[PDB]
Design a protein around this ligand. Structure first.
Ligand SMILES: N[C@@H](CC(=O)O)C(=O)O
Ligand SMILES: N[C@@H](CC(=O)O)C(=O)O
Ligand SMILES: N[C@@H](CC(=O)O)C(=O)O
Ligand code: NA
Ligand code: NA
Ligand code: NA
Ligand code: NA
Ligand code: NA
Ligand code: NA
Lengths: 408, 408, 408
């Protein structure tokens, strides 16, 4: 009974209210132990679907599309991704000069120290996209190396169709069918898991507002508004405009990508949201060729929401330490924050941990006593910011896929 | 050559003789390094078949029968499994009052103090039944999450069969067929492995008896006879009885379930016995809809043998510690042992580890010096006790499966 | 554009020359960070293919051929492998008495010490050949357990083809197809990756010669000649001969095993070369039933080149230490090095680590101050000796598969 998109808006509005109120009376722990378990289940059920929906769909996508098209799709979507993420930092820097976050605040030094993780070599990150055991890749996480093998196998399936033989032609047929069976099966599960969505959506914002909704006051409120307006200016001033330029109706696009966004926002897992956003692409008739490859890649590569968050936050820590950033340093963030955004995981809370890499680049390391105590205020409300981020991170990928789709 | 059921009975009788003799002359070391490995190969060979046989069969299972039907079957088998587990504890309690194991014996306090392995939250265990990577589930054991994803998968295939499409209807059929292929194959294998069964049976008891046969004398003899006749009354006073009331011939049931029951007794791994118990279920012509779900679920959930074991051993420790248990402390045993038995793994010797959980609830902890030296005497003959447990643990799943089967 | 078998030879010759030049002028680090990655990309690409190609092919192979044939092929190949490995050591010893590596040399003692790894019991290594989760076998490396289960599955698919049922016989057919689909699909992928091979080959020797080429002077040069002249005399005197005897024209055998021999040489992974060496088998038209099972087993069991290397080194150390080995100690190397060779991993540089095992049997342990400092000279030019080893390790697998196929 009842429409599904309504249930989520009701679970979202009611849950955000129920969270705040329950949380302001000090029931931060009563929500976590009682409410959260239902929001947890919603994420768990989705994660389930990620690996099969991604692997199977993309073998069929790479079998259906031309190997010259797939490669063209690739270069087009990377150029899109890179420029959207670059414009996203500058939008968060402009939002950090418009609003002033932590302008004249002096924070309690010596409270908490942090320890930055040494990032692995670029060579190793790049060579690691080619999996040495595809069964291993599936067996544990690893969407990117899966993407790679999938395409290669999909492509090989096509070459086995052109075969003179009959025994080969059929066995290649039999494989691709069954793989597509799983694919089609998965897209059916996501609907069923979307049926639980409202209950899960309710519980998740109830937890986030109950645990952190009470700390969105003071200079942490002004850093919050700087972000959410900045992200709102990313959806309108960038996506709505680039969809208008490419002749796609931007209003009915939000109609088609509603379920992805609300999941991304609440779930705060770009990775987790993948089977919803992938269905949302099939909803709007984009070829399994294109969206099977662009979405999972964009799940990790394209993070406009994160790119922006790391901008406004770099400025926050720079304002609450006294000294401002050079006009040459403002262009040194744009590069590193896009590099940090690419590198960030499609998992909850990973942006703030990756914000540490864009903090050394400007000159204020996270081992510095007072920088560390400033960072800890932001990490205090990170799950509030995380919600906006992920949603834009996800919206960005779908916007891209739609554009590449109309071009071909 | 030769009948196979006879071979296992010869391997069992000869093995337990050769083991008791060799072990009495102190050749526990020789039988461990020389004979036991042949009994291991049999165990290994069985484990092998579990993942593919469970998964592949249950996908077919959930597609084969109505999603409503599977639901009812579930509620029916859970109501079966709980009541049979609760009857099992009370039967062991009467067996621990009929006999007095550890009646007037004092033990050498301080030999070995045991240690708390903190249990995980039930909310987490329950949440853990949903697998976040179906591959990762299969990849490493994990029967329950696989049961989840399997049913879910199967159920989705059914929906693709009712599709208006042709390309969707065929590729879903193709998939169900391939997965059915695997299922069928793993049944064929378990027949093969069942030919090595006698050799592996021989070696397995030969080791259990060599290692622990001698110690089954004195008060430990009384506690052994307590358990065994208690288990015998579970089969004759509960299984034989409930099979009659439901209109299934108890003796033709025991004939068809023989291989399963023997594997279980010798293997002492309710979980390793799964592919034999699953074959046995198919041998009695039961539907893959029913037994594909019930047997793997019951392999972990329904442990009447473990429940009865924990019963008698609670009374054993209580008698060896002097003070008896109240009528309300005995009704407190019933509930905790049900939890402990369900919570107990289908792996060998695991119930003695969960016995500690049912000893905290009465008021006699495992870290208390003289309880710890009383529990060590039990752990000393646990392999002799484990054989019986596992056998009844597994018999009950088949009994329950058969009963729900006839009713449908 | 351009043939492949030409491109590889130009990459190897130009690459071995560019390597030696760059490294002699101290750029051994420059090659390692710049050139080497390309050569690693090749290895990742091949490795990708090993798990699906080995599994899918052998299930088809074992379903393709008679379980009596496969059994016979197995005993024929094991005999072949053990005999050729034994002969390889006796050839190495004859090279190391003809040449005198480390005759009049006395080394700087005490610089470096080594740590002998504790090898697990043979019974444990044998038992672990049966997997306990086939999905865990694939998931992480584990060619041998896969091999085992693959034959089993293949043989079961067959018995399912003889069933009176329609629904069983078609599902058995469907599964076999989809598995075969993948197998055919992987072989095409190797055709593609072999296109990158010359770029990979060029880089991989650039590295090896840059790092260790310059070290091949003095007494270390005399050992390198000893191993190579031996390995050559294994190719001509053992393969070219045993092939002619069995009636396969050797000259065209080398022609059709070119891609494998050169991948093995440059890549140094007997293991990672397998998808090339399995294709090369198919190219000369050997039955899948035979090479699906001989070649992957051979990758781990049959290492003529390693066995030879261990012979000529066991004679280098002993020469540097001063006191010679007995006639009965030479025959003690023959036995230990065949053993060690069988045990030695299909992975780059493993024979050297395994050389310790054969050294202890002659009475010169690796903990000994001066043995450990001579052994570090051998370990210095290892990649150099490893290239030749690996090639001859693989060639004997193809020679064995070829011979055994001709006898049927
Ligand atoms: N939850 C965010 C993580 C981040 O913003 O760093 C995402 O997956 O996009
Ligand atoms: N062998 C028993 C283990 C136990 O009951 O503790 C089983 O798996 O059923
Ligand atoms: N690279 C060699 C290692 C060895 O010589 O043991 C091989 O894979 O065969
Ligand atoms: Na994203
Ligand atoms: Na990212
Ligand atoms: Na059980
Ligand atoms: Na249990
Ligand atoms: Na080899
Ligand atoms: Na080896």
């Amino acid at each position: 009974e009842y429409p599904v998109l309504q249930k989520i808006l009701i679970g979202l509005i009611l849950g955000a209210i129920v969270g705040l109120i329950l949380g302001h009376y000090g029931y931060a722990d009563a929500v976590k132990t009682y409410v959260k378990p239902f929001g947890d289940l919603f994420v768990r059920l989705l994660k389930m679907l990620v690996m099969p929906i991604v692997f199977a769909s993309l073998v069929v996508g790479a079998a259906s599309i031309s190997p010259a098209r797939l490669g063209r799709v690739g270069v087009k979507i990377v150029v899109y991704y890179l420029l959207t993420s670059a414009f996203a930092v500058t939008l968060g820097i402009i939002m950090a000069r418009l609003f002033n976050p932590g302008a004249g605040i002096h924070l309690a030094v010596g409270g908490q120290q942090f320890q930055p993780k040494q990032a692995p070599p670029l060579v190793k990150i790049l060579l690691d996209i080619v999996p040495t055991n595809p069964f291993g890749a599936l067996a544990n996480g690893q969407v990117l190396p899966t993407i790679f093998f999938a395409i290669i196998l999909g492509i090989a399936i096509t070459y086995l169709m052109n075969s003179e033989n009959e025994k080969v032609r059929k066995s290649a047929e039999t494989l691709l069918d069954a793989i597509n069976g799983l694919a089609e099966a998965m897209y059916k599960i996501v609907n069923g898991v979307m049926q639980y969505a409202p209950i899960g959506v309710f519980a998740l914002i109830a937890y986030v507002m109950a645990e952190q909704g009470v700390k969105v006051v003071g200079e942490l409120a002004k850093v919050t508004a700087a972000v959410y307006v900045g992200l709102t200016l990313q959806i309108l001033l960038v996506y709505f405009v680039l969809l208008k330029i490419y002749g796609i109706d931007p209003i009915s696009f939000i109609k088609k990508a509603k379920d992805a966004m609300l999941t991304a926002f609440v779930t705060r897992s770009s990775s987790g949201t993948l089977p919803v956003t992938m269905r949302v692409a099939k909803e709007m008739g984009i070829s399994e060729g294109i969206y099977s490859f662009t979405l999972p890649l964009g799940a990790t590569i394209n993070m406009d929401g994160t790119a922006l968050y790391q901008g406004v936050c770099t400025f926050f820590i720079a304002n609450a330490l006294g000294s401002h950033l050079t006009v040459g340093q403002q262009l040194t963030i744009v590069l590193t924050a896009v590099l940090a955004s690419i590198g960030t995981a499609g998992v909850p809370g990973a942006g703030a941990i990756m914000l540490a890499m864009v903090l050394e680049s400007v000159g204020l390391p996270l081992t510095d006593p007072n920088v560390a105590a400033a960072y800890a205020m932001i990490l205090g409300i990170d799950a509030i910011l995380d919600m906006g981020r992920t949603m834009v991170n996800v919206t960005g990928d779908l916007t891209g896929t739609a554009i590449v789709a109309k071009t071909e």
